RNA sequence: CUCGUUAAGGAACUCGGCAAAAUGACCCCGUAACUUCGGGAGAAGGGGUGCUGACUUCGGUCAGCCGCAGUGAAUAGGCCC
RNA sequence: CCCUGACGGUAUCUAACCAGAAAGCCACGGCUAACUACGUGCCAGCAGCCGCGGUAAUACGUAGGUGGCAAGCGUUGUCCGG
RNA sequence: UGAGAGUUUGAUCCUGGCUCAGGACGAACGCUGGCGGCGUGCCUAAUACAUGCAAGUCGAACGCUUCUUGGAAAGAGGAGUGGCGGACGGGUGAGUAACACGUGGGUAACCUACCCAUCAGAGGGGGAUAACACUUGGAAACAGGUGCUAAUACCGCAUAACAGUUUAUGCCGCAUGGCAUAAGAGUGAAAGGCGCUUUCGGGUGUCGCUGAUGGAUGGACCCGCGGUGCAUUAGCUAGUUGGUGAGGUAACGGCUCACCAAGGCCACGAUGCAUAGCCGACCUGAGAGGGUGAUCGGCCACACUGGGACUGAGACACGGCCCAGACUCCUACGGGAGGCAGCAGUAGGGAAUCUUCGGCAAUGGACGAAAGUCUGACCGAGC
């Protein structure tokens, strides 16, 4: 569960470090997000380089949370991390690389351009 | 690779490091089995000196250090024995 | 693998060759160890000098000549007298 | 041994390290652009069988191979003390 | 009312980090701007710490052993611009 | 004795025919070789340095002529000389 | 083989700067163009690279298999084990201010496949394996399992010390030491193929195989001297400088270790920062000098960026291996593939720089006994 002033590392390349989350997209009261939630959120430190640049806004959807995630067959799936990925509206990485794993959840809410790129899907 | 010589240089090269490690190998435990009986004071101690000096020798033949190393060798085990 | 092999000196289609001992890696117009005669392809009975004072010397140290220097060389009488030398003693 | 090495002459210079003392070889050689007459020095270390000689000796040394990162010389003998 | 613990988040609380939590001993390494040249200075930031044996020049160092954790309890600076 | 040329029917040589197909770029006030007309009027323009242009301009723009080189001729940049 | 001129003033002499008259170029661009000969042609992004080609060869080392002329001998194909080559030839100048290069020396501290010479050997055994046949998992790249087989593939046993080392002798040298002769101790190799004579003949030609010594050729290390700006860059070093021993290398050495000491370098420019491959040579100048290091030759360094080793006589490897990184590509999502600063060629940067050509006939190179096979080196053609 991620809200509002949560710190994310970022798993692309993209020119991010940390992201600070301001809303939980979806919903009128809406308190946390999960694993394939979109998200708005500042950009509080950058690399010296890059497309994006620190102070801001902007869109990422959440992969790899340490309170993970349940599947329908009674198994359990959790993170030592939260991360995200910076996405350009119609669900594309702004980057071109994904680091780390990352859970299969993507594939049911349709970011198939980011299931391409990931080097362990689990 | 590329090249078709290529490709069996890679086999070819990977089959002779294997037989050169073995080799070499035993040449390093038979000194080392000297020494640890010379360091006791233990009877049959001349016979393994021999065998010693065989090893560093046959190890010569095969390729595996140069000349002038099994000369260093032989000099200082046979001052280390007889 | 010292050899005695030709080395080529024209302009375009005007060849002259230099005779000349040179390690066998070495590129055909790139170093080598010193020169020892002349050839010329034209002027139709072909034109050779050579010194045949170090070509017998170099020979008799393991030099090898390559098919053309050998040609020329037996021409003017230098394989007998390796041969004179050599074998007989 | 029909070739030779290298001997040459100075004054002892330092003396503190065991069995190594620094000769300072001088010499003139002159300006490349004006005409006039420069002195020049350059150090060099020789090898000391005993701590021997000792600060304004005149000696000779002589060229060995490598002793040490850094002394490539030999003592060859004392020509003239200090006192 | 006085105490002990708490998933995920970590000042989003409130007039205001109030109150809590965190730092805390000894040994070693290191330590900026500025300055009335004394200071600033415990600046900051990092490492070691139990037990057995051998050697111990002396003060310690090497080899080995056990646990999640060795100032294994109690007592003891949060810091920076 | 016998055997091999990518270039390539290339260079070259012989016969016939025809002045017929084949000249441009820069400069001309002083330095620095080479001058007169017309147009324009401190305008339009020129200049490496001196400096030209306001009614008779050998300094601007054209024409005729002349000078330097020539299948090239001028311009800019870089280096040594003076 | 040493030429000068204009321009400060109302006029002058001196001082002084600025400008012009000569050369040259990997040149670019404007106007304009008939030919032959010989040369030259990415100076910028060491930017990213579609497509073809640039390194193989040997049946006279070895077993298999497919044809064309049921037992037949030749000719032409296919993969495999084994040898040698792939460290050369070809490209580029990013790093480097230092034994990198130039010139002059040293090694009594060194290695060296193929090639030439000399001496001595070449005995007698063993256990396997690819191929092949069957079989499993694979999207693929590819991996495993079972059974049979050959050698100049591999492994032990014999015999050989001329090699190294130690002792005595003689001669000698620039410290360490060098040469020659005598002994003593432990030890170490090897492979056949094609022919000729073939009465069993058991002989022999040739090419290969093992040990030792010379030559040649190629590489390695150490030293003197020489070539750049800044002092509005003065302190730099802690394996640092020396000793004892041990390990290590072809080899000497703080090369690397443990101990002991407190040394080393600097105004004759240490250290740091910036820029740069170096030379034969090339342009200009009366010379002394000054400015460049393009075609051609020599030495060095690098190979998408950064680490490492292996095989080998030789590489820490230019069309080799392993790991990390960025980038590009194919995938059934489990995974796989790649490196033009070789020759052509393309997009991009720029004021700016060529054909996706023919041939191994000549010269050189690899393998083979040889015919030959390979060669974008190279010889020619095109703009």
Redesign the pocket.
């Known amino acids: 569960?991620?809200?509002?002033?949560?710190?994310?590392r970022v798993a692309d390349?993209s020119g991010a470090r940390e992201i600070?989350?301001i809303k939980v997209l979806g919903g009128s009261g809406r308190k946390?997000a999960n694993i394939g939630d979109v998200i708005v959120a500042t950009v509080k430190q950058a690399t010296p380089g890059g497309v994006v640049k620190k102070g801001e806004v902007v869109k990422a959807v959440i992969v790899r949370?340490?309170?993970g995630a349940r599947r329908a067959d009674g198994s359990y799936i959790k993170f030592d991390?939260?991360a995200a990925v910076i996405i350009r509206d119609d669900k594309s990485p702004r980057?071109?690389?994904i680091?780390g794993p990352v859970a299969?959840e993507l594939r049911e809410n349709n970011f198939m351009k980011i299931?391409?790129?990931a080097?362990?899907?689990? | 690779?590329?090249?078709?010589?290529?490709?069996?240089?890679?086999?070819?090269?990977?089959?002779?490091?294997?037989?050169?490690?073995s080799?070499?190998n035993?040449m390093r435990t038979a000194i080392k089995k000297f020494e640890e009986a010379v360091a006791a004071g233990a009877d049959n101690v001349?016979?393994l000196?021999?065998?010693a000096?065989?090893?560093?020798?046959?190890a010569?033949?095969?390729?595996?250090?140069?000349?002038?190393?099994a000369?260093?060798?032989?000099?200082?085990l046979?001052k280390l024995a007889? | 693998?010292?050899?005695?092999?030709?080395?080529?000196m024209?302009?375009?289609?005007?060849?002259f060759?230099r005779i000349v001992?040179?390690?066998?890696?070495?590129?055909?117009?790139?170093?080598?160890?010193e020169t020892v005669g002349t050839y010329n392809?034209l002027k139709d009975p072909a034109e050779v000098v050579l010194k045949e004072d170090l070509v017998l010397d170099?020979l008799?140290?393991?030099?090898?000549?390559?098919?053309?220097?050998r040609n020329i060389l037996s021409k003017e009488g230098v394989m007998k007298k390796h041969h004179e030398a050599?074998?007989v003693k | 041994?029909?070739?030779?090495?290298?001997v040459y002459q100075g004054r002892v210079?330092?003396?503190?390290?065991?069995?190594?003392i620094?000769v300072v070889?001088?010499?003139k050689?002159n300006h490349?652009?004006y005409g006039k007459r420069?002195?020049?020095?350059?150090?060099?270390?020789a090898?000391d069988?005993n701590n021997t000689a000792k600060v304004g000796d005149i000696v000779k040394i002589?060229?060995?191979?490598?002793?040490?990162?850094?002394?490539?010389f030999?003592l060859?003998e004392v020509v003239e003390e200090a006192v």
């Not at chain 3, 001992?21 to 160890?33: E, K, L």
């Open positions: 569960m991620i809200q509002q002033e949560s710190r994310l390349n600070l989350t946390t949370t340490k309170s991390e939260n980057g071109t690389r680091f299969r299931v391409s790129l080097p362990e899907v689990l | 690779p590329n090249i078709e010589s290529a490709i069996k240089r890679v086999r070819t090269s990977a089959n002779a490091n294997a037989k050169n490690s080799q070499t035993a001349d016979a000196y021999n065998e000096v065989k090893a560093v020798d046959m010569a033949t095969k390729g595996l250090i140069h000349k002038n190393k000369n260093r060798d032989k000099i200082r046979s007889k | 693998a010292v050899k005695i092999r030709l080395k080529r024209g302009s375009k289609k005007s060849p060759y001992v040179a390690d066998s890696r070495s590129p055909r117009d790139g170093r080598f160890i392809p170099w008799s140290k393991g030099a090898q000549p390559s098919d053309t220097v050599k074998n | 041994e029909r070739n030779q090495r290298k210079v330092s003396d503190k390290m065991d069995k190594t620094t070889v001088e010499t050689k490349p652009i420069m002195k020049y020095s350059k150090k060099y270390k090898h069988e002589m060229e060995t191979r490598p002793l040490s990162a850094t002394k490539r030999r060859l």
